[PDB]
Design an enzyme around this catalytic site. Structure first.
Site, PDB file in Angstrom:
ATOM      1  N   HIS A   1     -13.511   5.285   5.243  1.00 18.36           N
ATOM      2  CA  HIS A   1     -12.421   5.754   4.333  1.00 18.36           C
ATOM      3  C   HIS A   1     -11.644   6.859   4.992  1.00 18.36           C
ATOM      4  CE1 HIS A   1     -10.295   7.579   1.084  1.00 18.36           C
ATOM      5  NE2 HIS A   1     -11.115   8.561   1.153  1.00 18.36           N
ATOM      6  N   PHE A   2     -10.348   6.652   4.955  1.00 16.15           N
ATOM      7  CA  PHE A   2      -9.365   7.991   5.437  1.00 16.15           C
ATOM      8  C   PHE A   2      -9.315   8.792   4.384  1.00 16.15           C
ATOM      9  CE2 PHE A   2      -7.225   8.767   9.340  1.00 16.15           C
ATOM     10  CZ  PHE A   2      -6.461   9.890   8.978  1.00 16.15           C
TER      11      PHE A   2
ATOM     12  N   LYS B   1       0.884  -0.869  -0.068  1.00 13.89           N
ATOM     13  CA  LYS B   1      -0.147   0.185   0.128  1.00 13.89           C
ATOM     14  C   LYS B   1       0.970   0.979   0.092  1.00 13.89           C
ATOM     15  CE  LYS B   1      -4.326   1.829   0.692  1.00 13.89           C
ATOM     16  NZ  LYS B   1      -4.445   2.231   2.082  1.00 13.89           N
TER      17      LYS B   1
HETATM   18 CL   LIG Z   1      -4.377   7.093   4.741  1.00 13.94          CL
END
Ligand SMILES: [Cl-]
Ligand SMILES: [Cl-]
Length: 124
Positions: free
Chosen positions: A119-120, A41
């Protein structure tokens, strides 16, 4: 599969510590939370507060999301957070990250019932 809220908690919740321990924190956390399972990620932020506090943001300041959505909320107070970003010398499967601790206002997108973060979006 995985629910949207469970993915958020898994990817961004870390009540365990109060701050990014050392500069190797990210390399460990991104691995433990399986954010480098089949891919690194590139960017990811962890929040160092209780789940309750993070969920409460879904009923705080209603701000616009970066993508245009209108379901983003910003935390009234700053929170201890750790931003994890892939280093220039990083590549699956040997993922590397740079740890950056800070106290910022988290911004998360919420949905569902209960209304929780899914969701960030960012930190300010
Ligand atoms: Cl993030
Ligand atoms: Cl504050």
């Amino acid at each position: 599969k995985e629910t949207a809220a469970a993915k958020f908690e898994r990817q961004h919740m870390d009540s365990s510590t109060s701050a990014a321990s050392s500069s190797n924190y990210c390399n460990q956390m991104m691995k433990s939370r399986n954010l480098t399972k089949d891919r690194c990620k590139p960017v990811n932020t962890f929040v160092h507060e209780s789940l309750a506090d993070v969920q409460a943001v879904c009923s705080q300041k209603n701000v616009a999301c970066k993508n245009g959505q209108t379901n983003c909320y910003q935390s009234y107070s700053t929170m201890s957070i750790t931003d994890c970003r892939e280093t220039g010398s990083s590549k699956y499967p040997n993922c590397a990250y740079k740890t950056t601790q800070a106290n910022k206002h988290i911004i998360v997108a919420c949905e569902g019932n209960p209304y929780v973060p899914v969701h960030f979006d960012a930190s300010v």
